[PDB]
Amino acid sequence: QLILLFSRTALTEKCKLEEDFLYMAYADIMAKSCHDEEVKSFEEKEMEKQKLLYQQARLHDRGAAEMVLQTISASKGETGPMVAATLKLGIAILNGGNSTVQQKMLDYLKEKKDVGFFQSLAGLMQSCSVLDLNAFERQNKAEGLGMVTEEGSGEKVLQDDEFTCDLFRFLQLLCEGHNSDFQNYL
Amino acid sequence: GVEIETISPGDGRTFPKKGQTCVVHYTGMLQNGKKFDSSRDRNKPFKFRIGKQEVIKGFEEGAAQMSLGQRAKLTCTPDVAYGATGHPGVIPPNATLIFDVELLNLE
Amino acid sequence: KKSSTLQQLISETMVRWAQESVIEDPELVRAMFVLLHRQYDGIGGLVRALPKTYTINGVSVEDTINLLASLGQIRSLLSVRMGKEEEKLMIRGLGDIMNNKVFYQHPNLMRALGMHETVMEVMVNVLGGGESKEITFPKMVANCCRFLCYFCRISRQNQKAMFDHLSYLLENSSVGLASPAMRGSTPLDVAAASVMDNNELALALREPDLEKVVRYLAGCGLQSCQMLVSKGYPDIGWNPVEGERYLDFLRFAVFCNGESVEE
Amino acid sequence: LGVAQVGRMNFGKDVSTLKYFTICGLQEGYEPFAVNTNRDITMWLSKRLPQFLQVPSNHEHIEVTRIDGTIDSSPCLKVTQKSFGSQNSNTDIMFYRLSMPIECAEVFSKRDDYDFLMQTSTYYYSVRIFPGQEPANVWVGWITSDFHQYDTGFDLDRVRTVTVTLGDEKGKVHESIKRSNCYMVCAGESMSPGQGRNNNGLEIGCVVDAASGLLTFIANGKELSTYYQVEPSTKLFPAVFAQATSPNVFQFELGRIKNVMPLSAGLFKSEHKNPVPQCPPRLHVQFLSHVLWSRMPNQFLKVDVSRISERQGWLVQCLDPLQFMSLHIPEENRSVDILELTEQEELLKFHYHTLRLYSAVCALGNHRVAHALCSHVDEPQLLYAIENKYMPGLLRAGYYDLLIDIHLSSYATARLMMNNEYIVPMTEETKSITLFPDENKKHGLPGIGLSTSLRPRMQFSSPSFVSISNECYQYSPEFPLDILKSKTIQMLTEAVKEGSLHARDPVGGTTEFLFVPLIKLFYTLLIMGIFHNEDLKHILQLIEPSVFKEAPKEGLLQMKLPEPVKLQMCLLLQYLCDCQVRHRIEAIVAFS
Amino acid sequence: LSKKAKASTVDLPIESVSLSLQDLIGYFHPPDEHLEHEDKQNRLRALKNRQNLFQEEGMINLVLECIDRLHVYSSAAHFADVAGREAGESWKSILNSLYELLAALIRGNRKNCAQFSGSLDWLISRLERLEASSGILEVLHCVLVESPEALNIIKEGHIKSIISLLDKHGRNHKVLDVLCSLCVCHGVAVRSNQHLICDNLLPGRDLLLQTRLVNHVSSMRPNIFLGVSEGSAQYKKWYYELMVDHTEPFVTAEATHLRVGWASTEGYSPYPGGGEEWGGNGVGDDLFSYGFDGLHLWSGCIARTVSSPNQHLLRTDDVISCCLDLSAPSISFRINGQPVQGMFENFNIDGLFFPVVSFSAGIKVRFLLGGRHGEFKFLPPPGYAPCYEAVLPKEKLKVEHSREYKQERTYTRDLLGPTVSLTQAAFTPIPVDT
């Protein structure tokens, strides 16, 4: 029911994807539940793979793979916390190259003939940030003059390095395992 | 001005003076007979001072002629009460108000 | 048996409802899961509540109550459309709040209550109302701009908080520059005060924001003043009255504390 | 029931009272009609006294045609019989009236000129008896709302009348006033010249002077000797009584004559100064009929009658108060019980939307409009509406919303909009606060405790319309909050047990109508914080007995409730969690 | 056609326009509720795109021009005279279809409703017409609901026309809904509109139904049924007294009701006539009853003030004596032995009269019917006979409810049908002519 509510909200026609705290919290919960994370035995690794498969099935059997695509499509290429949470959820359900999730996503995209998904994917790539030498120089001068910057990490330079990594890891997981069908679809 | 018709008799000796509070129950009715105000509905007596222009002059002059414990009918012409502009939302313009007033106590 | 806790009672009840019936009401589903998430994430309630917690001395209780009442009166103006009767309420509330001592003594409680957003949003609702029709109720907008300038001048942290809302004020910056006797009481003045005499904020100021102001200045140099020519002023190709305001803003942006910001 | 017949109906509300149910009806699975009911069933009877209602479009005797008035012809209403001539036709006298009355002045004073028409208060309508309808079977004139007389044989002598004669102490009659419900003339006697109908159908003219109360009739251009003088403030309904001897009976002409203002000016206030005659859609022909139902009151006055003794006579004693809320139709000058709207759908819908308009005009802190609305919807009427069990669900919800918006919404919003902030003063009361009530780590009841955080101030203004001071407009009108608190607690307590039995007759007709308004009022009171200590303890026990036991009944959380009520319960549980968060913040400050 | 023109030379595509309007309405029909969420969203998106395309191509102004051009003719008969019989027949349908199409084109779209703000004033100018009132009101409702800007155009002259629509056209809840939408839109309240609606609609108390709490009023009467008729053995003068042992002026917010006098029955039935059974009506609230409250004379629900020594509303320890003379119709009252300076005269006597008292909660009254039952405190006026003398020999005098239904158990309640005419009250001796 929660997954259906979140999917219906995404499918609802809106000019902009409004920020929803309920989604931003439950998507994080559902993403953490999937992963739940010196040589290890083969039996132990096999057990850990089967546990991850079960934890991913518990969510993609209820429609999370069709939710993460709908939210990204409704984002309309606007970077935000909702998109970041959706990408994290997609990565969590797609870890290990889950063939079932890949097939469900490809089938859903093909049957819906969704163009907004790919348009939003292009928009997010265009909106992704890079190194900004001007901002770096301004921060260096501000620190040198004597006042301390409110952020010690210089977060203004390279605005979102986690969002870009998640966005490209999602697309790599989508094609992992030499999934030729989705590789050609992209 | 205002007519006073006595509904119930009073003591006939104690009248309000200047600088004294009048405690009354009143029931406001229009000429057509529709109620618009009643202190008994709110179950609280109404207190006002004579000569301080805290009430409409028709009500004031009508209650000034009453005695302690008297119940009387006060008919205020549209000139002593809310003039011609009326009270917005309650009293229509150029309306005559009939009041059933009982003087409880002078304090 | 007994859950013995409100948290446990809610956590059991809401899941029980969801598993008993397929709820058709999205509002009910959303409220249900919001409540369940709140029960499970107890520490998040404190994480959200503590930043909104302020501590005052006993002697300032009455003044704080008066300030909170005035804040409530100003906040309630957000749910009503702007008018003549509401203008007086807004002005009186703003005057009382500036006269109150807590406004100066506790700027952190000021920023936590966050009137620097409430005044902005009221003002910009007014500006959007009749935008092409040119600003109506100009005196309240002037009062709001003066209040925001004073809020900036009270503390350096308040100036930084105001700096966050810098770009938006600069789209809403062509309102009353031409209007005389409005000087020092415009959103452009608020923007200038947001970056006045602060090296950190001057350096944090971005390039597209300056590009927008330069574009406004170029437009003012290319085109005349419609309001002045409507009032009957002799038509000239350019607009000195409008241009000088943007020039002063650029002066405040580039020059700070006697030195010059090279960037 | 026939003539001189006495009967009794037993709905089996108490199964023991059914005499033959066990011998025949219990084993077969049949159930008493009122088996699962807590309140008595309302019975409706046939009305003895006829009333005036609009002629139905499907009436099999009467047909009404609305003729729009041209530039040269006045608007007309035309009354015909469709079933005339054929078998089952109606030979009895039919009483017709117009739906809107003319208002006589409160105090009696003591080319047509445009100024004269603007200053005059004299109105006119004419009735054209069609050539062929015998004028001796047609009467024309005015009637009042008191007219409920249905006689197969009507005559002007039989009309009800009385002559109140007031005199001085000596006894001389210093005024004599005649009062009657019918002021009408007969066309047969009105045709004074004779043969006036034959060449052209009689146009009986009715002239009323609202400034003097003088009713004058003109037939064929000559003023008849018959005239009437009515009391001030009298409401006169245009009316025509006719026995039809023809398929076409008569016509209602809404025209005007020389120096006389048209009738649409006296009927409608918007057209008070419009000499052009008009027939707006509100005006329509009504007829007197017996097809109406009457609702028997659930409770009657308790009156004790007994003969005290030989000398003292018979004693009549009534001591307990009983009241009912009455709906008044302004145009028809009629009043009916509001509980009669359970079968009148159009009035119910219009009044529900009127209540919504009342709640909307005072929405979002319009304190002046709330003060004005206190005159129209009073405190006793709100309390009776809240308490009443037989009220329709729509009106129940509307009156609950009206009470909340007029008296409570302002402060409820004021406290809600300052909820997620915690300004706690530094006093000894704050220092005394601790996370747990005692050494045992057992959570206290939510809400109950000592809260020192600063909270908005509650202020109210007394609604009075005899005070010229305008400073009363700020602050919402005052209400008896303690009485409302006790009522809400009592009715929640009753509804918890009533709903649990799953009775077939919930208050308002549905579980939603029973619970949503009452729980909404409870939530508003809780938000405003009127509930203190023991009241909160009792209502928390009502919400959930086992969990909130202080240290067999099922609380609201376990009664299988509808979704709208579940949403309100979610709101209440949210408020309790907010109270716990505030207590935690205060304890943290105390430790700090 | 408007320019003088020869009718048949003008080619007016009535059927094509009607069919195109019917197709356009289906082309803009809103999605059905029972459809699935995704399908409903798709249909809504398609509808929004269609509305945007139509508004960008300016199909709103064309519909407005057609409506304005069709309103030049007052009625269907006028349009038929100008153009032709089929055109006159289809005129009303075309207007309704055009208004429905406009409502469908602007419904749910904020940009279209914002663009309709300028034409709002033109639309309200024909709200009074019965030819287009419903469609104009629906368009107004959609525009006001969907456009925050639209409310700023509505002025006092536009609000008063909508209010007067209620007066002219009668009660209609859609007008109330439009007035509600005027006050608050999207959670924002327009205080000027609220004040205008209140000040222009509420004080009249002539359109909206009014409410008030009324005390229940019941009536007690003796058994006697006395009347006057030709050739009857009934004495024409009667007299009885009522004593008030205790009365409470205000048992509730409303004043206590206490009226005494005589009442009559319609015809020879034993049922009181002309009055309702249960409610707030008492003695003197109809033209069949005659009352006295101590200060006024009540008849037909109009009260006239009557003078008396030391006038007061009926109090504790007050003796009211009632006199009825049927020889010349006259009802007179005497309070505490002093005469009340007023009387009822010349009323209908084609019925049976009986003593009656009406009251509400908080009384304690006593019938002094004279003789064995009661003892008169004051000597009856000469000629008048006491009321106990009218009891039939086999009957026993008692005070019972005026109306047949009283307070009792439901299953024990005696439902009563119509009662036979009580002709035995007037004993008219009619020997057979011989």
Curated annotation (Swiss-Prot), chain B:
Keyword Cytoplasm among UniProt keywords: yes
Membrane-spanning ranges: none
Compartmental location: Cytoplasm; Sarcoplasmic reticulum
Catalytic activity: [protein]-peptidylproline (omega=180) = [protein]-peptidylproline (omega=0)
Keyword list, A-Z: Cytoplasm, Isomerase, Rotamase, Sarcoplasmic reticulum
Annotated family: Belongs to the FKBP-type PPIase family. FKBP1 subfamily.
Function recorded in the entry: Has the potential to contribute to the immunosuppressive and toxic effects of FK506 and rapamycin. PPIases accelerate the folding of proteins. It catalyzes the cis-trans isomerization of proline imidic peptide bonds in oligopeptides.
Protein name per Swiss-Prot or TrEMBL: Peptidyl-prolyl cis-trans isomerase FKBP1B
Curated annotation (Swiss-Prot), chain E:
Induction of expression: By TGFB1.
Domain B30.2/SPRY residue range list: 164-374
Effect ascribed to mutating residue 31 to A: In CPVT1; uncertain significance
Compartmental location: Sarcoplasmic reticulum membrane
Reported modifications of this chain: Channel activity is modulated by phosphorylation. Phosphorylation is increased in failing heart, leading to calcium leaks and increased cytoplasmic Ca(2+) levels.
Tissue-by-tissue expression: Detected in heart muscle (at protein level). Heart muscle, brain (cerebellum and hippocampus) and placenta.
Function statement: Cytosolic calcium-activated calcium channel that mediates the release of Ca(2+) from the sarcoplasmic reticulum into the cytosol and thereby plays a key role in triggering cardiac muscle contraction. Aberrant channel activation can lead to cardiac arrhythmia. In cardiac myocytes, calcium release is triggered by increased Ca(2+) cytosolic levels due to activation of the L-type calcium channel CACNA1C. The calcium channel activity is modulated by formation of heterotetramers with RYR3. Required for cellular calcium ion homeostasis. Required for embryonic heart development.
Notes concerning its domains: The calcium release channel activity resides in the C-terminal region while the remaining part of the protein resides in the cytoplasm.
Disease cited in the entry: Ventricular tachycardia, catecholaminergic polymorphic, 1, with or without atrial dysfunction and/or dilated cardiomyopathy: An arrhythmogenic disorder characterized by stress-induced, bidirectional ventricular tachycardia that may degenerate into cardiac arrest and cause sudden death. Patients present with recurrent syncope, seizures, or sudden death after physical activity or emotional stress. CPVT1 inheritance is autosomal dominant.
Subunit and partners: Homotetramer. Can also form heterotetramers with RYR1 and RYR3. Interacts with FKBP1A and FKBP1B; these interactions may stabilize the channel in its closed state and prevent Ca(2+) leaks. Interacts with CALM and S100A1; these interactions regulate channel activity. Identified in a complex composed of RYR2, FKBP1B, PKA catalytic subunit, PRKAR2A, AKAP6, and the protein phosphatases PP2A and PP1. Interacts directly with FKBP1B, PKA, PP1 and PP2A. Interacts with SELENON. In cardiac muscles, identified in a complex, composed of FSD2, CMYA5 and RYR2.
Family: Belongs to the ryanodine receptor (TC 1.A.3.1) family. RYR2 subfamily.
Protein name: Ryanodine receptor 2
Native species: Homo sapiens
First-to-last residue of the parent protein present: 436 to 869 of 4967
